[PDB]
Amino acid sequence: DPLDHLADKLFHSMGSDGVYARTALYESIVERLAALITSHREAGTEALRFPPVMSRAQLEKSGYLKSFPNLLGCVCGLHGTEREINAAVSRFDAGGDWTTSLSPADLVLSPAACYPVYPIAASRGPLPKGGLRFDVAADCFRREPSKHLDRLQSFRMREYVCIGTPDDVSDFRERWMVRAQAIARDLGLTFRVDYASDPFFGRVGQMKAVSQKQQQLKFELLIPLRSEEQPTACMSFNYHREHFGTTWGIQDANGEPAHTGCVAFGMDRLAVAMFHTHGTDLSAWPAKVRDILGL
Amino acid sequence: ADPLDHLADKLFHSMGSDGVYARTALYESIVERLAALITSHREAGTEALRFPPVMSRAQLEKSGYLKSFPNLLGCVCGLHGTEREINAAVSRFDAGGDWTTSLSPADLVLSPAACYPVYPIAASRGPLPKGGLRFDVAADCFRREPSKHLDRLQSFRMREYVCIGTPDDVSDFRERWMVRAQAIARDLGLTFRVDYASDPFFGRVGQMKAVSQKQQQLKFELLIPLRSEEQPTACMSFNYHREHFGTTWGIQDANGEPAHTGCVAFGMDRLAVAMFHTHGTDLSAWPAKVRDILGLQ
Amino acid sequence: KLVDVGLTSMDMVNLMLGVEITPENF
Amino acid sequence: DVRNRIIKLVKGILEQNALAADVTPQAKLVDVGLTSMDMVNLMLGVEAEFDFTIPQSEITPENFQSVETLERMV
Numbered sequence: 001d002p003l004d005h006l007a008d009k010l011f012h013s014m015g016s017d018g019v020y021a022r023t024a025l026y027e028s029i030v031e032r033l034a035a036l037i038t039s040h041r042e043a044g045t046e047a048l049r050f051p052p053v054m055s056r057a058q059l060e061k062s063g064y065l066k067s068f069p070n071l072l073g074c075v076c077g078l079h080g081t082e083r084e085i086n087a088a089v090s091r092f093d094a095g096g097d098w099t100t101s102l103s104p105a106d107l108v109l110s111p112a113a114c115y116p117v118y119p120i121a122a123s124r125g126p127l128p129k130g131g132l133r134f135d136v137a138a139d140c141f142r143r144e145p146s147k148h149l150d151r152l153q154s155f156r157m158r159e160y161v162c163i164g165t166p167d168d169v170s171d172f173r174e175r176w177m178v179r180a181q182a183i184a185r186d187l188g189l190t191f192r193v194d195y196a197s198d199p200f201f202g203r204v205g206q207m208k209a210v211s212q213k214q215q216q217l218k219f220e221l222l223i224p225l226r227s228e229e230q231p232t233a234c235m236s237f238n239y240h241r242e243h244f245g246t247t248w249g250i251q252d253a254n255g256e257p258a259h260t261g262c263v264a265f266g267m268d269r270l271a272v273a274m275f276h277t278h279g280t281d282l283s284a285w286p287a288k289v290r291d292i293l294g295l
Numbered sequence: 296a297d298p299l300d301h302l303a304d305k306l307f308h309s310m311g312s313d314g315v316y317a318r319t320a321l322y323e324s325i326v327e328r329l330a331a332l333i334t335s336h337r338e339a340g341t342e343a344l345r346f347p348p349v350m351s352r353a354q355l356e357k358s359g360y361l362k363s364f365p366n367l368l369g370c371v372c373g374l375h376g377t378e379r380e381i382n383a384a385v386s387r388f389d390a391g392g393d394w395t396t397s398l399s400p401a402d403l404v405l406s407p408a409a410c411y412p413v414y415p416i417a418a419s420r421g422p423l424p425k426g427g428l429r430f431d432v433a434a435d436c437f438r439r440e441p442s443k444h445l446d447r448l449q450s451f452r453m454r455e456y457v458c459i460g461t462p463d464d465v466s467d468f469r470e471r472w473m474v475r476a477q478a479i480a481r482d483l484g485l486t487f488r489v490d491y492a493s494d495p496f497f498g499r500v501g502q503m504k505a506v507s508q509k510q511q512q513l514k515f516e517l518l519i520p521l522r523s524e525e526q527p528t529a530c531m532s533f534n535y536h537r538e539h540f541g542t543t544w545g546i547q548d549a550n551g552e553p554a555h556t557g558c559v560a561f562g563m564d565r566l567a568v569a570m571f572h573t574h575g576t577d578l579s580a581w582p583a584k585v586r587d588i589l590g591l592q
Numbered sequence: 593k594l595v596d597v598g599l600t601s602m603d604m605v606n607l608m609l610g611v612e613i614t615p616e617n618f
Numbered sequence: 619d620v621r622n623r624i625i626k627l628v629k630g631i632l633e634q635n636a637l638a639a640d641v642t643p644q645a646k647l648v649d650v651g652l653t654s655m656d657m658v659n660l661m662l663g664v665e666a667e668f669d670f671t672i673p674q675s676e677i678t679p680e681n682f683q684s685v686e687t688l689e690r691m692v
């Protein structure tokens with residue numbers, strides 16, 4: 001795989017595919033990318049930072065299980081009595097399976113950064129004119145083990161989320177699709193923006209995808225990393241219509257169920273794209289890119 | 296009502312779960328400034344690694360975490376079955392039942408402490424050089440201890456400097472970090488004391504391990520009175536592990552003996568909460584020495 | 593075309609259940 | 619003081635493991651050389667020898683400081 005050679009400078013093995021320790025070099029560029037993204041934040045945008053876990057009930061309510069049940073990481077633990085826990089530990093001591101004593105917590109690992117923002121927004125009553133905009137980030141988890149450096153199980157996601165009327169959200173997404181491309185250009189990256197779909201689970205799911213593609217609810221900024229034939233989505237631009245507005249009872253300024261949309265930046269994918277494109281020697285990166293990043 | 300509770304309005308938003316909060320821009324700005332301050336004290340030659348919020352379950356098991364805090368560990372589980380089995384689980388959910396009966400453990404856990412993954416990484420490099428190795432590590436950590444108090448979270452940030460070497464390398468490291476950490480706390484205008492302490496080992500036999508630990512003075516904590524001076528909050532710890540990780544991971548020091556390790560740990564969220572409790576939520580009203588030290592201007 | 597009629601997803605789902613699956617033959 | 623002589627024996631038996639030293643009633647157990655697993659094994663030895671079970675509330679540094687403070691607990 002074309003990205004494999006980057007591993008030695010960027011990552012250390014943590015004994016699990018898609019889960020890596022990040023070197024100082026790698027983290028310095030993720031940090032500069034995050035700072036660059038922040039510098040493009042629209043005025044009036046509320047910034048929230050989420051932990052890597054969120055309420056299981058909130059995620060269930062958002063409908064994640066109808067779409068990607070196969071990707072979800074649930075938090076489980078030994079919730080029993082002292083005696084039961086001791087047996088589990090004793091089983092482990094004997095080289096057995098202590099994990100049979102696990103039961104689900106009321107938490108999951110967040111599969112995307114925006115999910116927790118919807119109930120937060122909803123708790124504030126009806127939307128002002130022009131809607132609400134949020135800047136959110138979380139370390140996310142998707143259960144998709146792979147050896148490829150652009151397909152991680154644990155990865156950073158940064159998002160700008162818009163909640164409002166259809167026009168508010170559509171205008172928002174159009175601004176960000178142009179703006180994202182300008183950022184990618186400034187970063188010296190090769191890319192194209194194309195129609196896309198989420199990888200919905202099951203037979204029905206793949207037909208949900210076709211319909212999604214047909215309605216142009218999702219665009220991706222695609223960067224050739226292993227090949228030009230199979231480029232990597234490093235950003236997405238998502239229109240959810242009224243799904244979350246209805247789910248969480250968010251009402252726009254006109255009394256109608258809010259529309260929502262988000263622009264998502266895959267921070268690790270962007271960092272890997274930078275190193276693939278420009279190499280691991282920062283002093284040799286192009287002057288304009290070094291400048292854009294404040295190096 | 297807890298004395299910290301009034302801080303929630305400015306610092307956090309509810310995420311529907313005790314100990315799990317969204318962080319406001321105000322709160323995060325201070326966590327970031329504290330992180331940068333800690334970085335400014337990093338010793339030369341210290342290798343910086345950043346870990347994700349999950350780590351290998353096998354590695355954590357091998358590190359002995361289950362024999363110590365089985366109750367705090369968060370495991371990752373998933374739906375690992377056939378497409379039919381997974382569809383059925385979702386249909387049970389649709390029909391008022393519990394989809395989670397189809398979960399099975401993954402090979403990952405949520406990391407309970409930032410330093411765990413670094414020992415196998417160190418081990419893979421062969422014998423330690425003279426003077427040992429130093430690491431700067433950080434991770435979002437998880438401990439299953441739900442609570443409504445703003446100083447006891449389930450998901451929280453930990454930053455550590457870690458020393459791996461001879462007993463003497465490690466004791467020297469801890470001694471210097473105990474002094475420096477106090478200087479930092481003092482520079483931040485915090486009221487604190489440093490005291491011998493123990494980890495909350497599980498079960499009756501665990502209580503004894505705690506006794507030995509206190510007796511051997513293997514753990515110090517920097518304690519800050521937040522709700523009261525009777526139950527202060529441990530915001531940093533200074534831990535000597537003796538040869539536990541060295542033996543476990545086969546790390547040999549420069550003299551061919553099983554390496555000792557230790558770490559100084561900063562609780563980033565506790566430090567941030569300590570700062571807001573101590574100085575209030577209006578940053579312009581913070582003492583000038585503190586604003587200066589943090590680069591607030 | 594086929595999606596401009598007003599057929600959204602939940603509407604396209606029933607069309608799947610009324611009558612490999614690529615965004616071309618539909 | 620059958621207890622004292624027996625306590626010193628089990629302590630001396632655990633210390634009889636790649637080590638050797640002196641043992642007095644006012645001497646602190648940690649100073650003697652006992653580590654965590656030793657203290658665990660010593661607690662099990664005491665519980666097995668005197669046919670009793672130490673309450674969790676009694677497992678404290680005070681009671682397990684020295685042989686003196688230990689015998690005073692039993």
Ligand SMILES: Nc1ncnc2c1ncn2[C@@H]1O[C@H](COP(=O)(O)O)[C@@H](O)[C@H]1O
Pocket residue numbers: 112142144150151152153155157233234235236264265266267268269270
């Ligand atoms: N497994 C993954 N590894 C790394 N980055 C990812 C992964 N999945 C998604 N991302 C990034 O997160 C962004 C948002 O994800 P999505 O919600 O799937 O559109 C994507 O455009 C990618 O840049």
Ligand SMILES: Nc1ncnc2c1ncn2[C@@H]1O[C@H](COP(=O)(O)O)[C@@H](O)[C@H]1O
Pocket residue numbers: 408438440446447448449451453516529530531532560561562563564565566
């Ligand atoms: N539940 C918690 N919530 C917030 N911070 C914590 C929590 N547990 C530990 N920490 C922080 O992490 C540091 C290291 O943890 P420990 O390994 O328990 O000494 C502590 O000194 C605290 O500052």
Ligand SMILES: [Zn+2]
Pocket residue numbers: 112113114115159161238262263264
């Ligand atoms: Zn989103």
Ligand SMILES: [Zn+2]
Pocket residue numbers: 408409410411455534557558559560
């Ligand atoms: Zn540590």
